[PDB]
Ligand binder design. Structure first.
Ligand SMILES: *Cc1cc2c(cc1C)nc1c(=O)[nH]c(=O)nc-1n2C[C@H](O)[C@H](O)[C@H](O)COP(=O)(O)OP(=O)(O)OC[C@H]1O[C@@H](n2cnc3c(N)ncnc32)[C@H](O)[C@@H]1O
Ligand SMILES: *Cc1cc2c(cc1C)nc1c(=O)[nH]c(=O)nc-1n2C[C@H](O)[C@H](O)[C@H](O)COP(=O)(O)OP(=O)(O)OC[C@H]1O[C@@H](n2cnc3c(N)ncnc32)[C@H](O)[C@@H]1O
Ligand SMILES: *Cc1cc2c(cc1C)nc1c(=O)[nH]c(=O)nc-1n2C[C@H](O)[C@H](O)[C@H](O)COP(=O)(O)OP(=O)(O)OC[C@H]1O[C@@H](n2cnc3c(N)ncnc32)[C@H](O)[C@@H]1O
Lengths: 577, 577, 85, 85
């Protein structure tokens, strides 16, 4: 470790790695710090789902996810346990226990909000859905020219899609994907379009998909190395970044305080450029700990003078979920082209189709798969091959249906016991609402309570806003109930429900972007530069100032690219030495 | 990859790494294969609990464990789900679904039995308890001389303890450890001894323990390298080892068939020496797939001619579990030396002790910790400091109490919601029974059904034997109920119960050791050499032929050391070239 | 009314506890009953007054579409009959 | 019915029940029959069902009925956790 870099990046998530990819490639001397450690194998920051074993045991990956989601703010527990033995020590009050945050109103929380501290951040476990935002969901990059604004976003999203290896073809030969997508397509009478979820992923074989991650964006290997002898990059895991040091004028950052969690020692690192990509919660924490905004319980009597909008106007998406069990009608349609005679397992049983018949509803490739499954596995009552890939269907957010949708199979919510219902029948439904930014919705940090890293304890003061946001959330629930019904009935134990607020992990607006600090109630400009500061930049979903239902990471990435362009235009890399 | 090695080792668990440590150091050209991949960070095969983040969030590590325990044999699911919508496709029978094994009698299973496929094997997540076996639990290494047998085991265990970094001091300054251990020590009236669980672990700080693993035993880095320029070692992850090739005489292994799971290609590897350390289940699978024992459902009419005892006499431990909530009596004793005046949080409140007072029940270090906690945290009603390390107590197996005990805090069974009971109050109780080896207790492999790696599907035919084993298991349950009561009442939701058979993961005897193949109904001799074969060795708990309650890994390691000594005595390493 | 043979696997019994080798007819289960072609919720009430001792008391009329015919070929006459009854 | 065994944490004045009831086509294959060997607690032939909801109109309507309850209930309030559709 040197004491001086061109660029320091806090956080090795996919957004931190966007800055590294851009800036390391442009010849800057870059250091990157992560509070978390190298986890994912020799491919640093790679997707943990990319083992042969997980893709043969996909029901198990839910545990990997749960094992790295550490709750942001847990309120004081008030469950009454009055069946203790009389000899057992027993509380007289509901005191602060087990990491609970006594600042937290349990009724104004995002109880589901969690953070992930490992190299690669949440991109080591994520679902990889990377849709673009349409205009209605998207911040403006150009103020008064929608065509120019469209062009800018098209260019940035196109590059971001390249970085993530986003595709829409990886599941095209899945019978289950087809069954669902075709049925929905035919039922919405031309008024909603269904397509594959855009996924950051590359199929390697019929039964293996290499899911993208931070590592895809930037491989995180120290440089110079043999593959890049003129690049300069160092990654430092297990380093808690604690404060950036402002000058008096709030016009420059002069240092970054770091804490080595292995030795325990503390150091300060100097850079020309400071980039904070610690996540929506932890970017905000690092800034409040550095004297931006206001530490402690908010008060209107005394609003902060430095970045007053920091930690206000926070947004989280409402998320509704169910699973369905495929209809008899749909299962029967799989085998609609087959002539079926006799009883399975008996000598006279046969399943045949006519290749190329114009009356066939499916192409030969489908009918081949189905016939062979049915004949080779007469003990099995379903016409779907065992290793058929999962459905990956969406109808994207539109004005007439202002929510994102995923109709799919997610590694999450497999739970702890084996499904009695055949997996080939089960489809997940997740609809994601957009939330109006409101000043009263806050992420703030205690002036007394600290988290496990001795940093000010994050506390939410959040309610879904009462008007459009709430009306849409409930219409969205109804929409999932109506749409899912076309595919199958609900799976018992996965009935339609709102998920714990924040479990969706799509928090935005904690350090939001706009054109004008005061007029747009914001923290960074469209270069992601913190207002007033020459050399401090923020990256991540905390920048998104709008109400959005689609998954935010691709949008956050696109903003990060634009930010890197500004850095390239205004800072000179040091001589290679 | 070369096609020729001195020694090939199948499996990179702690036992495979014992063979590597011994044989790589002795100058053999060694190759090691694992079906699993490099997981744990840059320290290959290291303990996953050794991140700063897990040790600050120990409640989360249960998920890491569950996420790599893949069930060995799951019977056909027979749960009736009759609340499906009438449109949903519905089974007419309880057909084979979702990876269920149709060979498996659900009432003669080890339903809890699971396997872990990652580099380092189960030592990437294990509890690290490494007790020695006393004579009553231990196989004989010397037949007719108990003193010589003791000497041999003492020498081997001492070396094994060095490899694992086993210690009994890492928790000595824990108030909770002390509270529990002292109370039990005083109550058993000199007739049972309590000590710290021997743990393969090194404390790095008051709040961090470096748990041992495969990596501790052998760092798994390819050699030659800068630290070992004259050693030769290669590790090949994501390689399924499928068969060893016997000669006609069953006197030599001539090849190992391997399947590269990345390219898909298959190869054969030649070695002078073949060592199988794939685990108790998978060693047995590899051997049956190679023509040892009998493939298919067992029959007495036609017993196997090659290694007839393979997969018979299997043992698994009965395991009983509860948690307790510390008694008022014990909590009060923590602060017994304190003069306490007034009410917490009031101006006049004070907590004081007299340093060195002979009437004090605790030393100054304890009273300091307690006073400062009580005065600095008057909002907290407990006298135990927040970061006090967990209890790690045992009374080891003896004739009058023939079970192992762990009275402790395990990363497992934290479950999915936050404890409402303060963590400092909670103690885990796990008592582990010994199981008589019986011929009727079998691990066998289907001749038709295959697992996710296209290998013969493991199937259990197991019941706990009816006489001593069952009587002891129930006495053991009672013993946990009696002993735990001295510490506190049961924690609701963790009441005394038998765990799912095999969840304990202490399976032995699947390829058991003895002196004489026929007389001792066994598969390997005391050098772990397979009977009749010059160059095939088995390592792991599958070798242990006895009824044991203590955790088997240290014993398996000790046997592996003895096996390596035989290899060193009988095989010449190749010239370094 | 008809409870099928219970097939829940309880494998956490103590080794000393007596344990079934099969899923035998237990606890009033009906071995004739296919559990997958049942009305598992169907129940009966044996007390004076029958189920009207506990019922919800909702007494709607059936419209024609739900209702058996009392008069075969005259919907008006059929309506009159049902109205009177 | 369906109050269950623990106290509602949600105020009772807020809670409303929704029960929608489908019509089922009569089909010859749907039977109530009685065992010639097994008897009930009154030593009478044991009732046994052979029943499935018929596949066509009856099933289509049941699922449309579920949807209808979801749409209609939404006008009043969101679902009560633990009493989902
Ligand atoms: C958990 C999850 C997330 C997820 C998802 C499914 C799951 C189970 N599915 C997604 C999807 O389909 N599409 C999508 O767009 N997002 C999805 N997500 C969310 C997504 O993973 C996140 O939006 C994305 O990872 C955000 O990226 P970002 O780079 O901004 O942040 P990060 O991944 O959380 O990484 C931040 C890193 O910063 C380190 N850190 C935190 N604090 C510090 C300090 N103080 N000092 C130094 N380093 C710090 C963290 O350790 C982390 O690695
Ligand atoms: C899961 C677990 C285990 C455990 C424990 C707690 C948990 C949660 N606590 C323990 C304790 O406190 N004390 C103790 O003695 N044991 C404890 N255990 C069990 C312990 O981890 C195991 O006894 C030990 O790891 C056994 O070691 P071994 O080296 O013999 O086997 P392994 O760890 O299972 O590793 C085997 C490797 O082989 C690879 N494999 C399997 N099949 C193949 C094939 N066909 N080809 C190539 N490689 C193969 C596996 O991937 C694995 O890595
Ligand atoms: C349990 C229930 C029923 C119910 C309801 C809510 C509940 C919780 N809500 C209803 C509603 O809102 N609207 C409506 O129309 N019905 C509702 N029900 C169903 C309703 O109670 C029944 O349809 C009605 O009670 C049927 O009346 P019926 O007179 O035909 O039959 P019964 O009430 O079941 O009484 C029969 C009596 O016969 C005796 N019995 C049975 N077997 C024998 C033999 N072998 N020998 C002599 N006596 C016998 C029974 O003991 C019973 O009392």
């Amino acid at each position: 470790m040197d004491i001086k870099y061109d660029v320091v990046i806090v956080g090795s998530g996919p957004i931190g790695c966007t800055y590294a990819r851009e800036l390391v490639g442009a010849g800057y001397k870059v250091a990157m710090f992560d509070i978390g450690e190298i986890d994912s194998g020799l491919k640093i920051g790679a997707h943990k789902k990319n083992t042969v074993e997980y893709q043969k045991n996909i029901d198990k990956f839910v545990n990997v996810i749960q094992g790295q989601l550490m709750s942001v703010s847990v309120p004081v527990n008030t469950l009454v346990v009055d069946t203790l033995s009389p000899t057992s020590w027993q509380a007289s009050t509901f005191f602060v226990r087990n990491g609970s945050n006594p600042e937290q109103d349990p009724l104004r929380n995002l109880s589901g909000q969690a953070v992930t501290r490992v190299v690669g951040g949440m991109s080591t476990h994520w679902t990889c859905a990377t849709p673009r935002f349409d205009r209605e969901q998207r911040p403006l990059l150009v103020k008064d020219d929608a065509d120019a604004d469209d062009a800018e976003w098209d260019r940035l999203y196109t590059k971001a899609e390249s970085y993530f290896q986003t595709g829409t073809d990886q599941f095209k030969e899945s019978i289950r994907h087809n069954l669902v997508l075709n049925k929905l397509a035919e039922e919405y009478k031309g008024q909603r379009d269904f397509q594959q979820i855009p996924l950051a992923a590359t199929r390697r074989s019929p039964t293996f998909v290499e899911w993208s991650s931070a590592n895809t964006v930037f491989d995180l290997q120290n440089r110079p190395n043999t593959d890049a002898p003129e690049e300069r990059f160092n990654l430092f895991p297990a380093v808690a970044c604690e404060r950036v040091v402002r000058n008096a004028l709030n016009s420059e950052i002069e240092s970054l305080h770091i804490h080595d969690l292995i030795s325990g020692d503390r150091f300060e690192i100097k850079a020309d450029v400071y980039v904070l990509t610690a996540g929506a919660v932890h970017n905000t924490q690092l800034l409040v700990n550095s004297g931006f905004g206001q530490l402690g319980r908010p008060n209107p009597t005394n609003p902060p003078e430095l970045l007053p909008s920091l930690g206000s106007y926070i947004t989280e998406q409402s998320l509704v979920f169910c699973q369905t069990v495929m209809s008899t009608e749909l299962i029967d349609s799989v085998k609609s082209d087959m002539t079926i005679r006799g009883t399975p397992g008996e000598l006279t049983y046969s399943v045949t189709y006519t290749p190329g018949a114009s009356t066939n509803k499916h192409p030969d490739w489908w009918n081949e798969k189905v016939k062979n499954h049915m004949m080779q596995h007469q003990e099995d009552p379903l016409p779907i091959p065992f290793e058929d890939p999962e459905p990956q269907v969406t109808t994207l957010f539109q004005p007439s249906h202002p929510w994102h949708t995923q109709i799919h199979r997610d590694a999450f919510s497999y739970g702890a016991v084996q499904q009695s219902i055949d997996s080939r029948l089960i489809v997940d439904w997740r609809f994601f609402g957009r939330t109006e930014p409101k000043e009263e919705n806050k992420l703030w940090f205690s002036d007394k309570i600290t988290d496990a890293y001795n940093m000010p304890q994050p506390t939410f003061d959040f309610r879904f806003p009462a008007g459009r946001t709430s009306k849409e959330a409930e219409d969205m629930m109804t929409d999932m109930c109506v749409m899912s019904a076309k595919i199958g009935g609900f799976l018992p134990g996965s009935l339609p429900q709102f998920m714990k607020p924040g479990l969706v992990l799509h928090l935005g607006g904690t350090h939001r972007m706009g054109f004008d600090e005061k007029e747009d109630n914001c923290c960074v400009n469209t270069d992601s530069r913190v207002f007033g500061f020459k050399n401090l930049f923020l990256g991540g979903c905390g920048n998104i100032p709008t109400a959005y239902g689609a998954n935010p990471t691709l949008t956050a990435m696109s903003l990060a690219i634009k930010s890197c362009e500004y850095i390239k235009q205004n800072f000179t890399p040091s001589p290679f030495t």
